[PDB]
A paper describes a structure:
The importance of the ubiquitin ligase murine double mutant 2 (MDM2) as a key negative regulator of the tumour suppressor protein p53 has been studied extensively. Second, it promotes the proteasomal degradation of p53 by recruiting Ub conjugating enzyme (E2) thioesterified with ubiquitin (E2~Ub; ~ indicates thioester bond) via its RING domain and mediates ubiquitin (Ub) transfer from E2 to p53,8 where Ub is preferentially conjugated to lysine residues located in the C-terminal lysine rich region of p53.9 Although the relative importance of these mechanisms is context dependent, in vivo mouse studies with ligase defective MDM2 resulted in the same lethality as MDM2 knockout experiments. The RING domain of MDM2 has been discussed as an alternative target to stabilize p53.19 The rationale for this approach lies in MDM2′s ability to still bind and inhibit p53 when MDM2-mediated ubiquitination is abolished, thereby preventing uncontrolled activation of p53.8 The RING domain gains its E3 ligase activity through dimerization with either itself or the RING domain of its catalytic inactive homologue MDMX to form a homodimer or heterodimer, respectively. The dimeric RING domain arrangement is essential for E2~Ub binding and activation as demonstrated by co-crystal structures with UbcH5B–Ub (en dash indicates covalent complex).
We wondered whether the sequence dissimilarity induced structural differences that could account for the different aggregation tendencies of the MDM2 variants and performed protein crystallization for MDM2f and MDM2z. We obtained crystals for MDM2z and MDM2f, which diffracted to 2.87 and 2.27 Å, respectively. The unit cell for the MDM2z crystal contains two molecules of MDM2z, which form a dimer. The overall structure is similar to MDM2h (RMSD of 0.6 Å), where all secondary structure elements and the coordination of zinc ions are conserved. There was no electron density for the first 11 residues (407–417, corresponding to 423–433 in MDM2h), which are located N-terminal to the RING domain and partly involved in the formation of a 310-helix in MDM2h. A possible explanation for this observation could be the sequence difference for residues preceding the RING domain, which form a 310-helix in MDM2h but lack electron density in all MDM2f and MDM2z structures reported in this study. The helices are stabilized by a tight hydrophobic packing arrangement involving residues A434 and F490 of each protomer. In MDM2f and MDM2z, A434 is replaced with serine and cysteine, respectively. Both serine and cysteine would likely cause a steric clash and their polar side chains would disrupt the hydrophobic packing, thereby precluding a similar helical arrangement.
Numbering used by the authors:
A (entry chain BBB), B (entry chain AAA): 418 to 475
Write the structure that this text describes.
């Protein structure tokens, strides 16, 4: 799916939720960051967001 | 791009090259890891690979 950020649905999925050595890409960097600041869990696995990487394709 | 890992072209781009708080997604986790172990640079920006995240799209 080339579908947008699942939260805002207005921006691309370029906000990578890192937990250790695995990452989940369902949200934009800006949305995924708000989740971490407001102490929400990863929507994919409900595991704490350790950090957020701004991800660029090619 | 729905195109495969630029190195092996046999696995998806699920190997996120992290440098600071930005990541580059052009290679598979296994290919991007070999780059880090053999002290190669990020093919996108020729900046050192600080870590590699195994990324899952949802
Ligand atoms: Zn968003
Ligand atoms: Zn997760
Ligand atoms: Zn590869
Ligand atoms: Zn790079």
């Amino acid at each position: 799916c080339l579908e947008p950020c699942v939260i805002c649905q207005s921006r691309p999925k370029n906000g990578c939720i890192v937990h250790g050595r695995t990452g989940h890409l369902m949200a934009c960097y800006t949305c995924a960051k708000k989740l971490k600041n407001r102490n929400k869990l990863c929507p994919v696995c409900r595991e704490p967001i350790q950090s957020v990487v701004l991800t660029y394709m090619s």
